[PDB]
Structures are given as C-alpha cells and as structure tokens.
C-alpha cells in the first residue's frame, strides 16, 4: 500500500556461529509512507 | 460504568465503557475479542 513497514526485535544472546534456535515476535518500529518501487537493497558496515 | 454509545475514530457501538486491565503493547490501538468483535480500545486523546 506504499507504506514501507519495519518490524524489529532486540534480545541479548550468547552465540558464536549460529542464528538463535528459538522463537520471538517483532513489533512494528515504523510504518514509513514512501510509495516507491523496490527491487533490490544493500546493508551498511563500519570500516 | 453506565451503558453508552461509544465511538472512537468512527467505531459507533453501544456498551458499558469500563477501565481495562489489558496491557496493550505500545503500537496497539483496537482490541478485538475471541469473537472478532471489538472489546477494548485505546483512547485517542489520553493514554488508557
Ligand atoms: C519496478 O521496476 C521493475 C524493473 O524496471 C518493473 O518490472 C516493475 O514492474 C516495477 N514495479 C511496479 C510496481 O511496476
């Protein structure tokens, strides 16, 4: 509907090389009214 | 605690309004029952 919606969660953990084997809910942190076409995306690392 | 025609945001319906004990999450606006009828609602003006 032209809202780019972000759902998220934080938990502290203790793992070395796996995605945590379990279940949790993500809350809507924002619902940005942006209306654009998207096909691809990229993520930003500190250097 | 008296029967009233409630309306929040166009939700006309008749009932006793009562103060809830429900812990709705921060983003959360209407409560629906098991029956999918609305049975709780955040007030738009004041945080209850
Ligand atoms: C988004 O762009 C692609 C590639 O140009 C196109 O195939 C797609 O139809 C566009 N999205 C919409 C909603 O038309």
From Swiss-Prot, chain B:
Impact when changing residue 12 to K: In strain: Omicron/BA.1
Role of this protein: Attaches the virion to the cell membrane by interacting with host receptor, initiating the infection. The major receptor is host ACE2. When S2/S2' has been cleaved, binding to the receptor triggers direct fusion at the cell membrane. When S2/S2' has not been cleaved, binding to the receptor results in internalization of the virus by endocytosis using host TFRC and GRM2 and leading to fusion of the virion membrane with the host endosomal membrane. Alternatively, may use NRP1/NRP2 and integrin as entry receptors.
Subunit structure: Binds to host ACE2. RBD also interacts with the N-linked glycan on 'Asn-90' of ACE2. Cleavage of S generates a polybasic C-terminal sequence on S1 that binds to host Neuropilin-1 (NRP1) and Neuropilin-2 (NRP2) receptors. Interacts with host integrin alpha-5/beta-1 (ITGA5:ITGB1) and with ACE2 in complex with integrin alpha-5/beta-1 (ITGA5:ITGB1). May interact via cytoplasmic c-terminus with M protein. May interact (via N-terminus) with host bilirubin and biliverdin, thereby preventing antibody binding to the SARS-CoV-2 spike NTD via an allosteric mechanism.
Protein name, UniProt field: Spike protein S1
Organism: Severe acute respiratory syndrome coronavirus 2
Residues of the full protein shown: 536 to 583 of 1273
């Amino acid at each position: 509907d032209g809202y780019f919606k972000i759902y998220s969660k934080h938990t502290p953990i203790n793992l070395v090389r796996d995605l945590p084997q379990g279940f949790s809910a993500l809350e809507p942190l924002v619902d940005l009214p942006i209306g654009i076409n998207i096909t691809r995306f990229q993520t930003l690392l500190a250097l | 605690n008296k029967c009233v025609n409630f309306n929040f945001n166009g939700l006309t319906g008749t009932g006793v309004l009562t103060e809830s004990n429900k812990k709705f999450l921060p983003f959360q606006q209407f409560g629906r029952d098991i029956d999918d009828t609305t049975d709780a609602v955040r007030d738009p003006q004041t945080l209850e």
